[PDB]
Amino acid sequence: GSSGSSGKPSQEGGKGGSEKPKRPVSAMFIFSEEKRRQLQEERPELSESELTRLLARMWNDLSEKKKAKYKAREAALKAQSERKSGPSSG
């Protein structure tokens, strides 16, 4: 590994565009990524695969006041992994 050219997108080329295709970041993603690192240290016995189940349960325990904290950031984070959504080919 660590060697070998392999383009997934293929065709087209970002000459001077902005942003690039990436994994979205919903409200659950933020809380699932910000809480994971916290649970990992606090709970070294729990693995990432296991934390995924605990993160989902914690998200539900949250309140409308707390959820809004991450839900509000999603609107800004989504812009990174999403540009325009009008009538266009692609």
From Swiss-Prot:
The modification Phosphoserine is found at residues 26, 47, 49. Phosphorylated and activated by PIK3CA. Residues 21-84 bind DNA. It is found in: Nucleus, Nucleolus. It comes from the Eukaryota. Recognizes the ribosomal RNA gene promoter and activates transcription mediated by RNA polymerase I through cooperative interactions with the transcription factor SL1/TIF-IB complex. It binds specifically to the upstream control element. Homodimer. Part of Pol I pre-initiation complex (PIC), in which Pol I core assembles with RRN3 and promoter-bound UTBF and SL1/TIF-IB complex. Interacts with TOP2A in the context of Pol I complex. Interacts with TBP. Interacts with TAF1A. Interacts with RASL11A. Binds to IRS1 and PIK3CA. Interacts with DHX33. Interacts with PHF6. Interacts with CEBPA (isoform 1 and isoform 4). Interacts with DDX11. Interacts with NOP53. Interacts with ALKBH2. This is Nucleolar transcription factor 1. It comes from Mus musculus (Mouse).
